[PDB]
Amino acid sequence: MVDFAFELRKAQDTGKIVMGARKSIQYAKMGGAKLIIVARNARPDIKEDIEYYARLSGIAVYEFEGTSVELGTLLGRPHTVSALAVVDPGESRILALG
User: Fold this and answer.
1) Number of domains composing the chain
2) Three-state helix/strand/coil letters over the chain
3) Quick one: angle between helices 44-57 and 21-30, nearest 10?
4) Where in the sequence is the domain holding 46, given as residue range(s)?
């Protein structure tokens, strides 16, 4: 089974990810992400924008079952992260979550 925490870190380290609602929304809008991940407690209008732009392009959206605090911590950051976009999965299996 896909280990979310392991594969997400592996994507971050071997691939290319962009972090935050602004950049996630932008990459969804441009059709440049392969997966968008949103924290459970991402602001409603942010989730709804991400879901919309992703739906326009056929990009998978995955809802992480933890808070923006936990998601930030998983990504090595001492701050919240509400959303991220996987641009290049690297050597990871992260896109299987779609």
Assistant:
1) 1
2) CCCHHHHHHHHHHHCEEEECHHHHHHHHHHCCCCEEEEECCCCHHHHHHHHHHHHHHCCEEEEECCCHHHHHHHCCCCCCCCEEEEEECCCCCHHHHC
3) 20
4) 1-98
